[PDB]
Symmetry: C4
Subunit: 462 residues, 4 copies
């Protein structure tokens, strides 16, 4: 026994140090202030009424007339504070917003032969083949002439109804309110939005001097082929200026120290079994995170490029995307670095009995999870075919899955289930609740419960 | 052993092909766009304020004055966009809406003898015997003279307080707003709604050229015998024009291939046990679906009849109804086609132990399901007699059943339970929660748990 | 065996007939229309804004100024429809509403000695000893002179802050709006509400000729000793005129047939064990219900007393109360009549195993229910002392009990728990959820589970 | 056996008396009236709209302009009822409110070297080192000159973004509305709030003569370094004048009697065992509560000091703080006094089998609670790093813990989880629900279930 404990103790001390270094690094990413940074930003643009005479938020656009009322009203009064603007007196506006639109060709769809005398034209769903590249209206520059994703230094974006290319027709919005109002009013009078539009984007970014963060804003308004409007938004905080405080220089030392542990674990793996799989997972995700972290040092040259002329649009689109992907993988590595503690938790005959239960159980939990999810996904596809054209909570097959988890827990919206289909709605709900929650979910309890008393009946004797 | 595994494997390959054909066919019915088609429609007619000076939605009518304010206001501005109208610039209005009312005779009920000097008349709940067929008001046309369900090409409808005949008094609404306003104002000035009205219906339909769907609208406003008003609505998508894209012509090949599989399974069943019951259920439901699918081709001639003169009401009532019944049965066939996968899932000693648990358990789960539902329905009938005259969530014996499932899951409205009856409300809630959720629901759990360890203790030894 | 089955079958046939007669009698009490009767009533008086320039409902009074705005505004426009009034064109107003107030004496409490130079008077909480009986203001009749509970034909009422006597100062409101406005404005100008008030009541009643029901309305507005206002309401349906239709005359035969069954069971019991306890409970509650039914036939003469002069308040207060008590007891008899079906449900070796589980288990479930409820009520008293001065959901020891059931199920209001006390709120919630829901609630399940496998291990061998 | 029972009976009889005396004491401090005292107070200041024109509550400030609109508007109309003021006609305003602010130095933070030509200054997060002590503006007394926490008789306060010193810049608000409006307007015109503000406090107190309580009010408005505003409030009832009624004089005897029990139990425990641990807990907390109660008798001289000249701010801040801490420890001692009943509950072979289950189980429940909370806290840190900058329900690591308990119970806000991160949101929610609720939580079930059948299999034989 002792010679195994003597190597395990050195691994445990090494691992507690590795855990502590990553926890210090990742607590160093944020302060409670940063939620209020984005909350105060989003309430100014989203939750201010579109006009002083109107009930609608930007969260509640329904037409091109609402979108013009927003972009002439609530947007401009959010951006331009009385040259410079600070969107609150603490937070500097970085120069110049941008508007971009994406558009579809007239006649890009098959009108049925019976209707062609009555309906002259149609415009498809947005796609790279239906996308429109011809110049239109008065043709006075980039608002009315197409430019590609590569010409515009842009990237493809995931909307609600479609993914969208980084390309389009675009305008840069001036330093001040009176200039920008004349620009947006010129687009409106020239009918810059019409039948062919399928999205618009409004982008800008802001710097907080007091806690040293950049917040990058995207507003995306989609214009479905069914008619109507769908608004959406992003407000992303970034720490582009890496180090300024003594605490940043301490994090910079931990950031170097983390690479020594990752190198040590890469060598130990160079020198089949769940802990070895989890070691590879932790190491690979850490190497990916370090690769993104290193790549971000050259992406930060976009800030150096911007600071030569603050009449340019600050293209922090890629920086925000890779900060999000870094934060995503940092959060996931922290999670797996906690799960590995279960290698060491086996202190005594209680902890080893609990951990032996989970590993001996997982064979049957996996078998029953497939068996459960066939029935759950059959219910998801039943729900999608019955309610998916009526109920927001079921509008996509993805939402059918998430809503069926909400219903099993107790977050239920039964009034809209029944109003969508008075015959199948109650039958679906009643049978889903009965077969999932009163019957099938209790199989997990049976599997776990019998495995635990099995394991305890062995460890009482081994 | 080998020959049985090989014949089962040929059935499994045949079944995976059948499954994939039906999954392709039913994914072919819809796109995420279609929810936004009905959402953008319903928000225009339902959620727009009834008048610019008022707070009420069509969802919140409460009087004949609200209904006239709606039909002179929010309705007309939803229908007529500035001859033709597109209900959004993408969706064509098919010619002509229709208004229909159903009505009850004066003196169709027994006034108590003690009150006949004070109350001169009464008007019953709507029924086929209380229904009024006499001409009234100025008698100028079909708005003031009765016509039968068969004269009107209609069908009987399920409302909230009653089912309703397709018959009645009716008017067709003209091509444009100024014509329709003069028609509706003429009905209002002649007092076309009075003591005897028990429902009105407003019907119309629309076509989306961009994704090739019709949408059929019913608004039903009921006028209960208690006084007051109850609004309700339907917005139904329809794919009447079967095939136009290469993907539709591919789906048409899958539609023929599905008939060959159903023929194969009909012959195999012609050439007592749950899989045989499920095999018959899948076959019969698929034969009914194919029958409705064929009958719908005869019904689609109603579109060809309409397109000769677009100054006429498009009677897609039956097409919408049979599309709903087709979607209803199709969704249910998909569900049972997924459940049949369990005929083949017995890959190994884990999967056979899980499937053997459910079949060996279901005997005792059915016994306890009766025993549970006696107590549950006793509580449902207690709740209906105590709260049914006070609380919306218990306003019918059907609502009581669904609300008691919501309460067991934790979707609860306890403040209105107590305000309805301060003595029995808390007693009902407390005892229901204690006896159902803390006690009786755990019997299912005990039955399953003991069955699983029984089955596992056998399959460890057999 | 056979000689036992032959008597049990005759008891079962007798019991199914008794069950059906009672179920017919209680289905005879209601139609789905009756929910809409009370809903349409309550929305007119409660949910209409207090004044056209105001945001408050009667559900949202907060001052005597709101109460005068309601009683001069929304009340009068709800009652008087343009002599007679129909509260909707279907429902007759029975003559005359009544206003009553209850009041407390000046100096009915002990002002501290340190404060008597600064505070000249105090007025206690309402009680029968603090209650005020002196005439005040101009003393022009019953509005300004006290009359007792017996003088006024009244009864004691259960409010929110206190129970109230049926006594007080009172006024009868006239047949028409212009008369009633002059009466209420005279009370307002004479300052009829002042610091001494502790409640007002506004009472009236209504008749629906179309489904033959009366509705009796109480509005109670309480005026707490803390300052402020608490509104509350009752709308109660009544079937005073019992028999008019062929279905009522059928129910009148069922009503007599039910008395024959109760006589038969009284004799059988005159000719220690749970079924015998349940048999006595059903018989006693049925005899109490028949007694209340017979007493209500004598009370119904109040309608005959009213119908001589409809310029008088219809005192249906007792009829509404005894109908509520009849509905309360009838619903409970129906519940126990369903539970007695378990005396016969033992058809087979599955049903007898399920019923033997509950009877053999209940010994230990009762022991653990006490043991659980000591901890639950300790948490209820902890919550009452910490949150009960801050959070509505804990504002009484009864609310604490009902809210803790809601939290165990999943209906949670955690934001207000934390805002009331940022230190103990999270500690209370976290420990309550952990010890009740993750730990103690699983003891009921463990007791049931082990009892079931015990009972099944015997019935496999006996 | 008998000689153990005869001494245990004397302990039980002594303990029931101790229990009853404490329960009488804690009921004696409170009534359901007190919830309506704080509710009627808070609705006047918080829920009244900020002006006659604006929609915002004090609960919904977002700028210095909202704060000035509140303090010139909704505050003053809540305080000064038409010399004296009663905040409802029952509740006297004690003299004089106070406004205090806390402030940070210009240049107290490191502006990055790249930006110093563009951004002239920054102001840090509030801390005792960044705090500003210099006199500013016109310097006309205590509003414009700093005073220490000790000079101001104050204490340090726990806000939302920070703890705050009791020090600062302050003004005492006059007896009447016209005076107080001129004071607040003078601060507004002199720009008393600016870039450097990090909190303001508005404090006052009130007396209810009718139920003999003081209520002490704090309003705290924070001004984060991100720009924007965060409002918060406290309304605390106090029984400072201890005894006046015969019921208070009865409680004064119980309050002395309680000390004889605490002395008896101090002696008995002075003359490893869990019941002795619980005895030490009950005794120490009771001695601490008695110490706080005795200290509060000396603190009540602050009322006697205030009553000499009411043109002064009543500093009931410490009295309110210690009354809250007394209520906290009183509620907790009541809770542990209920738990000690489990010493005596062992009446019979059912109760001793239930109590033997919980003590024999707790070894493994502690082991698994550590094992569960590693995974739960890993998910908490994952959620904090992903959603914490976007979602209010995750805006701190403490909020993440409480929200994850709400989600396990079925209080869910899934729409905002997905809108914050469309990739990781659904993955986090789905895996959290699956691994916590369908899997890991059910280990607690397995532990308890197997322990109960173990203990019962022993007590069937011992």
């Amino acid at each position: 026994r002792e010679k195994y404990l003597k190597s395990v103790l050195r691994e445990l001390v090494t691992y507690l140090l590795f855990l502590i270094v990553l926890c210090i690094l990742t607590y160093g990413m944020m302060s409670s202030n940063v939620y209020y940074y984005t909350r105060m930003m989003s309430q100014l643009f989203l939750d201010t009424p579109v006009s002083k005479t109107e009930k609608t938020n930007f969260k509640t656009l329904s037409s091109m007339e609402d979108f013009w009322k927003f972009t002439e009203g609530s947007l401009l009064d959010g951006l331009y504070w009385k040259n410079r603007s600070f969107i609150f007196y603490e937070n500097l506006l970085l120069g110049v917003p941008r508007i971009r639109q994406l558009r579809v060709r007239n006649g890009s769809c098959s009108i049925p032969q019976d209707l062609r005398d009555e309906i002259k034209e149609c415009y498809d769903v947005y796609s790279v083949s239906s996308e429109d590249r011809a110049p239109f209206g008065p043709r006075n520059g980039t608002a009315w002439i197409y430019t590609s994703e590569k010409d515009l230094n842009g990237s493809s974006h995931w909307g609600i109804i479609a993914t969208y290319s980084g390309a389009g027709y675009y305008l840069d919005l001036s330093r001040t309110r009176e200039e920008t109002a004349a620009q947006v009013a010129s687009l409106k009078k020239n009918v810059w939005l019409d039948r062919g539009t399928r999205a618009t984007f409004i982008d800008f970014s802001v710097y907080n001097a007091n806690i040293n963060l950049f917040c990058v804003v995207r507003l995306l308004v989609e214009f479905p082929a069914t008619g109507g409007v769908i608004p959406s938004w992003q407000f992303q905080p970034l720490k582009l200026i890496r180090y300024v405080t003594t605490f940043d220089f301490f994090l910079a030392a931990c950031e170097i120290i983390f690479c020594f542990f990752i190198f040590y674990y890469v060598v130990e793996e160079i020198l089949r079994s769940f802990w070895n799989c989890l070691d590879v997972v932790i190491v690979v995700l850490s190497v990916v995170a370090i690769g993104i972290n290193i790549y971000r040092t050259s992406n930060v040259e976009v800030l150096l490029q911007f600071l030569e002329d603050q009449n340019t649009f600050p293209n922090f689109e890629h920086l925000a995307y890779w900060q999000i992907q870094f934060n995503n993988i940092a959060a996931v590595t922290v999670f797996f670095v906690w799960i590995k503690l279960f290698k060491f938790i086996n202190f005594n005959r209680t902890m080893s009995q609990l951990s032996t239960t989970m590993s001996r159980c997982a064979k049957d939990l996996f078998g029953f999870a497939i068996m459960f999810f066939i029935i759950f996904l059959a219910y998801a596809q039943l729900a999608y075919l019955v309610f998916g054209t009526q109920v927001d909570d079921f509008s996509t097959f993805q939402e059918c899955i998430f809503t069926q988890f909400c219903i099993i827990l107790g977050d239920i919206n039964f009034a809209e289930i029944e109003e969508a289909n008075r015959v199948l709605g109650p039958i679906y709900f009643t049978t889903f609740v009965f077969f999932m929650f009163f019957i099938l979910l209790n199989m997990f309890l049976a599997i776990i419960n019998d495995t635990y008393s099995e394991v305890k009946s062995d460890l009482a004797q081994q």
